[PDB]
Design a protein around this motif. Sequence first.
Motif, PDB file in Angstrom:
ATOM      1  N   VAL A 196       0.836  -1.186   0.000  1.00 19.85           N
ATOM      2  CA  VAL A 196       0.000   0.000   0.000  1.00 19.85           C
ATOM      3  C   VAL A 196       0.871   1.236   0.000  1.00 19.85           C
ATOM      4  CG1 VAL A 196      -1.989   1.147   1.064  1.00 19.85           C
ATOM      5  CG2 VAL A 196      -1.624  -1.303   1.441  1.00 19.85           C
ATOM      6  N   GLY A 197       0.685   2.054  -1.028  1.00 22.41           N
ATOM      7  CA  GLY A 197       1.381   3.317  -1.118  1.00 22.41           C
ATOM      8  C   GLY A 197       0.732   4.219  -2.131  1.00 22.41           C
ATOM      9  N   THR A 198      -0.177   5.049  -1.642  1.00 28.82           N
ATOM     10  CA  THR A 198      -0.861   6.025  -2.471  1.00 28.82           C
ATOM     11  C   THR A 198       0.160   7.140  -2.656  1.00 28.82           C
ATOM     12  OG1 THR A 198      -2.826   5.462  -1.126  1.00 28.82           O
ATOM     13  CG2 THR A 198      -3.159   7.089  -2.857  1.00 28.82           C
ATOM     14  N   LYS A 199      -0.256   8.207  -3.328  1.00 24.63           N
ATOM     15  CA  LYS A 199       0.532   9.423  -3.512  1.00 24.63           C
ATOM     16  C   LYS A 199       1.353   9.226  -4.781  1.00 24.63           C
ATOM     17  CE  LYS A 199       4.811   8.284  -1.312  1.00 24.63           C
ATOM     18  NZ  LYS A 199       5.775   8.405  -0.192  1.00 24.63           N
ATOM     19  N   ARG A 200       1.372  10.249  -5.633  1.00 22.35           N
ATOM     20  CA  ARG A 200       2.066  10.154  -6.912  1.00 22.35           C
ATOM     21  C   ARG A 200       3.553  10.463  -6.695  1.00 22.35           C
ATOM     22  NH1 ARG A 200      -0.012   7.510 -11.553  1.00 22.35           N
ATOM     23  NH2 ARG A 200      -1.901   8.828 -11.655  1.00 22.35           N
ATOM     24  N   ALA A 201       4.095  10.043  -5.552  1.00 24.40           N
ATOM     25  CA  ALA A 201       5.517  10.220  -5.265  1.00 24.40           C
ATOM     26  C   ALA A 201       6.207   8.883  -4.985  1.00 24.40           C
ATOM     27  CB  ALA A 201       5.702  11.174  -4.079  1.00 24.40           C
ATOM     28  N   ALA A 221       6.315   3.167  -8.070  1.00 24.69           N
ATOM     29  CA  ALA A 221       7.480   2.664  -7.363  1.00 24.69           C
ATOM     30  C   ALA A 221       7.123   1.508  -6.434  1.00 24.69           C
ATOM     31  CB  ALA A 221       8.126   3.777  -6.574  1.00 24.69           C
ATOM     32  N   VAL A 222       5.851   1.110  -6.428  1.00 20.84           N
ATOM     33  CA  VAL A 222       5.392  -0.086  -5.721  1.00 20.84           C
ATOM     34  C   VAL A 222       4.861  -1.092  -6.722  1.00 20.84           C
ATOM     35  CG1 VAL A 222       3.928  -1.024  -3.905  1.00 20.84           C
ATOM     36  CG2 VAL A 222       4.750   1.353  -3.768  1.00 20.84           C
ATOM     37  N   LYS A 223       4.418  -0.603  -7.869  1.00 16.68           N
ATOM     38  CA  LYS A 223       4.156  -1.500  -8.982  1.00 16.68           C
ATOM     39  C   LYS A 223       5.552  -1.884  -9.496  1.00 16.68           C
ATOM     40  CE  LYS A 223       2.257   0.291 -12.607  1.00 16.68           C
ATOM     41  NZ  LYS A 223       1.313   0.920 -13.579  1.00 16.68           N
ATOM     42  N   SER A 257       6.199  -8.445  -8.734  1.00 21.59           N
ATOM     43  CA  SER A 257       7.138  -9.407  -9.296  1.00 21.59           C
ATOM     44  C   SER A 257       6.788 -10.763  -8.700  1.00 21.59           C
ATOM     45  CB  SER A 257       8.604  -9.015  -9.029  1.00 21.59           C
ATOM     46  OG  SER A 257       8.919  -9.009  -7.648  1.00 21.59           O
ATOM     47  N   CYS A 258       6.758 -10.812  -7.370  1.00 20.64           N
ATOM     48  CA  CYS A 258       6.426 -12.032  -6.654  1.00 20.64           C
ATOM     49  C   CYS A 258       4.923 -12.278  -6.530  1.00 20.64           C
ATOM     50  CB  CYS A 258       7.019 -11.988  -5.248  1.00 20.64           C
ATOM     51  SG  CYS A 258       8.531 -10.999  -5.078  1.00 20.64           S
ATOM     52  N   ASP A 259       4.609 -13.189  -5.605  1.00 19.38           N
ATOM     53  CA  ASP A 259       3.244 -13.516  -5.192  1.00 19.38           C
ATOM     54  C   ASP A 259       2.702 -12.486  -4.188  1.00 19.38           C
ATOM     55  OD1 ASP A 259       3.990 -14.574  -2.344  1.00 19.38           O
ATOM     56  OD2 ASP A 259       5.262 -15.811  -3.649  1.00 19.38           O
ATOM     57  N   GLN A 260       3.251 -11.281  -4.266  1.00 21.72           N
ATOM     58  CA  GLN A 260       2.793 -10.159  -3.479  1.00 21.72           C
ATOM     59  C   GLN A 260       1.997  -9.218  -4.393  1.00 21.72           C
ATOM     60  OE1 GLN A 260       7.383  -8.335  -3.246  1.00 21.72           O
ATOM     61  NE2 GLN A 260       6.797 -10.456  -2.778  1.00 21.72           N
ATOM     62  N   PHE A 261       1.245  -8.287  -3.794  1.00 22.20           N
ATOM     63  CA  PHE A 261       0.268  -7.462  -4.522  1.00 22.20           C
ATOM     64  C   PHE A 261       0.437  -5.985  -4.144  1.00 22.20           C
ATOM     65  CE2 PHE A 261      -1.955 -11.435  -5.469  1.00 22.20           C
ATOM     66  CZ  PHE A 261      -1.563 -12.217  -4.403  1.00 22.20           C
ATOM     67  N   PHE A 262      -0.332  -5.080  -4.749  1.00 17.20           N
ATOM     68  CA  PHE A 262      -0.096  -3.650  -4.511  1.00 17.20           C
ATOM     69  C   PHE A 262      -1.310  -2.730  -4.631  1.00 17.20           C
ATOM     70  CE2 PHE A 262      -0.298  -1.753  -8.761  1.00 17.20           C
ATOM     71  CZ  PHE A 262      -0.246  -2.864  -9.572  1.00 17.20           C
ATOM     72  N   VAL A 263      -1.224  -1.584  -3.967  1.00 17.47           N
ATOM     73  CA  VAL A 263      -2.160  -0.495  -4.185  1.00 17.47           C
ATOM     74  C   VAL A 263      -1.356   0.783  -4.281  1.00 17.47           C
ATOM     75  CG1 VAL A 263      -4.212   0.757  -3.402  1.00 17.47           C
ATOM     76  CG2 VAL A 263      -3.963  -1.697  -2.899  1.00 17.47           C
ATOM     77  N   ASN A 264      -1.415   1.379  -5.464  1.00 21.03           N
ATOM     78  CA  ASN A 264      -0.555   2.492  -5.828  1.00 21.03           C
ATOM     79  C   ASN A 264      -1.376   3.767  -6.060  1.00 21.03           C
ATOM     80  OD1 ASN A 264      -1.607   0.872  -7.951  1.00 21.03           O
ATOM     81  ND2 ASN A 264      -0.052   1.563  -9.437  1.00 21.03           N
TER      82      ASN A 264
END
Length: 113
Positions: A62-67, A71-73, A78-85
């Motif tokens: 989890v990392g909102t903000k266009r800064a 950079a979290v995508k 890559s792995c079996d991990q997921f994201f919120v950008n």
Amino acid sequence: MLKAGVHFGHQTRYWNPKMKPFIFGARNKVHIINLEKTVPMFNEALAELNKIASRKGKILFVGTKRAASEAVKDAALSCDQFFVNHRWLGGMLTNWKTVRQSIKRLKDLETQS
RNA sequence: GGCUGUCGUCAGCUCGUGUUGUGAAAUGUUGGGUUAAGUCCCGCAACGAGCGCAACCCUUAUCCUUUGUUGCCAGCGGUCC
Ligand SMILES: [Mg+2]
Ligand SMILES: [Mg+2]
């Protein structure tokens, strides 16, 4: 200890007394974090994180903000991990059982995109 | 009962789940724009949905295909025009 080259920890007066222990700071009217406490923190942090990971566990970044958004995508994407950008849809986790079928749609769209 | 007028063809009226509040309730449906419109965009503890708006219906303005009497007469002859 400092395996971490450069991240001295910003934000000046706008602080939080709950964050006293992890502080050594006071410079130029702004706080400095703590070498000998940032490093020790991987101890309980990367230990449990790489254990539940071994037990086959979903992660979710989890990392909102266009800064740091794409950079979290990244090696998170890559792995079996997921994201919120971007926008964190309120209740996408506690109301998962509803938000879930907004995904089911995304699927139907890219499955014909 | 059924049917009807009215605010008003006004842009409104609500629910599920989640979340907040001891609670009545709130949020969604605040807000910045935008639209004939809760129209749409962005935003945002909301995520979605139902009625409504719009569209689907009829008619009108242009063209095309098929059709030619009881409708039509351009080029043809004849004229009691
Ligand atoms: Mg609507
Ligand atoms: Mg309509």
